[PDB]
């Protein structure tokens, strides 16, 4: 480990595991049906995924 | 007692032999252990030990199980004269996965865990069904002759097994894998029994004594035959020698002249006796440079588990035969068998193969158990069967707490 400031892991230390949030980025869905609309099936999935 | 010499296996397999201390905690020593492999590695002029990537170096037995950390070395079961090893185990540590909808997760992860069906596995499937389907074939051909001993039953016979024996040669010749092999071999095992029963039913007239003598004799060439040029399958064709050889002979004496089955009998038990004494010997004389070795050692293991099993079949078919309710001193081969069976119960404990063990054990208990149900089916009785039940089941009972307590 350095110092020198492009290093970004310095004076970092590990605890333990756990949970933490991916890299990839989410976009919203574009034209939502309103949710009297919803087809039953493919609204858990998405909610779910 | 404050030290122990062991050997330590390390990289590559060189084996070194060391003297450690006999109570400091195994963790203690690794390192050090591991500087002087490597020192004397260098010396040698060989490439030293290395890690790769993340992981650890641990001290584990010849089963590669690791000793405990914290441990004395003499709170575990390690002696002097005794081996070790030191191995790398790499890090294990990886991210979980999860699958949510609940199909594509089952499907997933129940591919991973078992086999599919495939193409290698079909062949064999198909192969062991023509070798049920014939011996099913040769079995109702051989029960027709019962009621009308003509021609037909060899005539027919005979072009199965012509059939069956032509496939095999062309499969033989071809095969190039162990795969290919076993279908090759399944193949020709199935052809010597249609052969067999062809031949045996060529004399002519009601069924008995002369018939039976072609058929063993047949069939003991035949099973020796398809040995000498194979070399595959030991044990199974072995087996069938030996009972094929001893029928051969008695038969012949049946055919012939004899005065009673009893008499004959007896002169089999003795014959199984006296070869059971003779059993090591005749699998030790049967059968870089290392290879020599090994191939003699299985070779020889084979034809002994086959031999142990071969007279094990004709004891207890000859020891079920010669005991009788009705017949004389209907005690007197009732405490014979009793003999016999203490006999092969004491010998078998001089194996440490485990089938060879087992296979001897458990011809004593099976002769015993014929016995019993002998004697409960004909003369029957309820005082008889209720005894007879009661021991049947205490008698193994008794056998499993013996080694059980």
Not at chain 2, 59 to 64: F, I, K, M, W
Not at chain 2, 264 to 284: E, G, M, T
Request: charged share 15%.
């Amino acid at each position: 480990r350095k110092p020198d400031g492009k290093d970004l892991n310095f004076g970092v230390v590990r605890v333990g595991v756990g949970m933490t949030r991916p890299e990839v980025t989410w976009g919203e869905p574009q034209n939502m049906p309103t949710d009297i609309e919803l087809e039953p099936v493919t609204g858990k999935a998405l909610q779910e995924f | 007692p404050q030290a122990v010499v062991v050997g330590v296996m390390a990289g590559e397999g060189v084996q070194i032999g060391v003297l450690l201390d006999a109570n400091a905690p195994v963790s203690v020593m690794t390192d050090p252990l591991l500087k002087v492999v490597n020192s004397r590695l260098r010396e040698l002029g060989e490439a030293p030990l290395e890690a790769t990537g993340r992981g650890r170096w641990a001290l584990c037995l010849v089963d590669g199980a690791p000793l405990r950390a914290t441990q004395s070395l003499t709170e575990q079961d390690v002696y002097d004269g005794d081996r070790l090893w030191i191995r790398f185990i790499a890090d294990t540590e990886r991210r979980s996965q999860v699958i949510e909808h609940i199909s594509t997760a089952v499907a997933s992860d129940l591919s991973k865990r078992f086999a599919r069906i495939d193409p290698i596995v079909a062949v064999q499937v198909g192969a062991s069904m023509v070798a049920t389907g014939v011996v099913l074939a040769t079995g109702v051909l051989g029960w027709w002759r019962w009621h009308h001993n003509t021609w037909l039953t060899t005539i027919y016979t005979a072009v199965i097994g012509v059939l069956v024996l032509a496939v095999a040669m062309l499969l033989l010749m071809r095969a190039k894998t162990d795969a290919d092999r076993r279908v090759a071999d399944i193949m020709l095992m199935s052809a010597i029994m249609p052969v067999t029963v062809a031949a045996a039913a060529a004399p002519p007239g009601p069924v008995g004594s002369p018939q039976a003598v072609l058929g063993f004799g047949v069939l003991t060439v035949a099973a020796a035959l398809a040995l000498r040029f194979t070399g595959r399958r030991l044990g199974i064709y072995t087996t069938i020698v030996i009972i094929g050889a001893l029928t051969m002979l008695a038969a012949l004496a049946r055919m012939v002249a004899a005065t009673s089955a009893v008499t004959l009998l007896s002169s089999l038990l003795l014959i199984c006796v006296v070869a059971y004494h003779a059993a090591p010997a005749l699998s030790r004389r049967l059968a870089s440079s290392v290879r020599d070795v090994l191939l003699q050692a299985e070779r020889a293991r084979s034809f002994l588990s086959g031999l142990l099993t071969g007279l094990g079949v004709m004891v207890v078919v000859c020891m079920t035969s010669l005991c009788d309710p009705h017949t004389g001193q209907r005690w007197l081969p009732l405490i014979l068998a009793g003999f016999t069976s203490g006999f092969l119960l004491l010998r078998g404990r001089s194996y440490v193969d485990r089938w060879q063990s087992i296979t001897l054990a458990g011809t004593a208990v099976i002769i015993a158990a014929a016995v019993c149900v002998r004697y409960a089916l004909e003369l029957s009785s309820p005082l008889a069967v209720s005894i007879v039940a009661a021991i049947l089941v205490l008698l193994p009972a008794a056998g499993m707490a013996a080694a059980a307590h």
